Design a protein around this ligand. Structure first.
Ligand SMILES: CC(C)(COP(=O)(O)OP(=O)(O)OC[C@H]1O[C@@H](n2cnc3c(N)ncnc32)[C@H](O)[C@@H]1OP(=O)(O)O)[C@@H](O)C(=O)NCCC(=O)NCCSSCCO
Ligand code: NI
Length: 159
């Protein structure tokens, strides 16, 4: 299969939401209710907010928003928020069927390459403690737990 990584653009908006929704329902099956997730997707992944984030990424401002496209179809994404010379990994979600094929590792490595080009040398993230899929992926990619906050572990990786 042919997997391409690039910045999202506004035309990706609808497939973006559908991927976010499908990944969330799978990822948080053990953890949140069907309705909580649907509410979160409708409030946080709203067309208006995602569009503003997609634009901020396009304008090389404080967001970096990339997608993984399999033969021209969005199957996953990563989103980073930059403040000063520190990045926070906000979101990294793949369609469940495309997991465990190193597409997420590839998203992560491309984001890392762009960050290093901008002189950013530190990435922090929030991962729910019961999300073993994500958590295990993170420590297998060099992230280390530095703290907790509520239900989440705060993990960090330095370059
Ligand atoms: C977490 C995601 C993005 C990881 O991307 P990949 O699936 O491409 O991971 P790989 O690079 O192939 O690495 C494989 C390792 O990752 C774990 N893994 C991956 N898929 C799994 C499935 N289907 N079941 C169980 N474990 C899985 C394993 O640790 C695996 O290593 P080995 O088993 O080979 O040793 C991706 O899986 C994904 O999108 N997951 C759901 C969403 C999610 O959890 N996202 C990140 C946390 S929320 S967001 C950012 C803020 O933290
Ligand atoms: Ni595995």
């Amino acid at each position: 299969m042919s997997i391409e990584i690039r910045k999202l653009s506004i035309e990706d908006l609808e497939t973006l939401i559908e991927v976010a929704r499908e990944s969330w329902k799978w990822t948080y099956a053990g953890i949140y209710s069907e309705e909580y997730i649907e509410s979160w997707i409708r409030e946080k992944y709203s067309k208006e907010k995602l569009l503003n984030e997609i634009v901020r990424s396009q304008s090389n401002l404080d967001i970096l928003f990339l997608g993984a496209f399999a033969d021209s179809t969005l199957i996953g994404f990563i989103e980073l928020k930059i403040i000063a010379n520190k990045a926070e990994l906000l979101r990294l979600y793949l369609k469940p069927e495309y997991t465990h094929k190193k597409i997420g590792k590839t998203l992560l490595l491309e984001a890392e390459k762009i960050m290093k080009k901008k002189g950013i040398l530190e990435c922090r993230l929030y991962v729910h403690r019961q999300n073993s899929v994500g958590f295990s992926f993170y420590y297998k990619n060099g992230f280390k737990v530095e703290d907790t906050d509520g239900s989440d572990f705060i993990m960090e990786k330095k370059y």
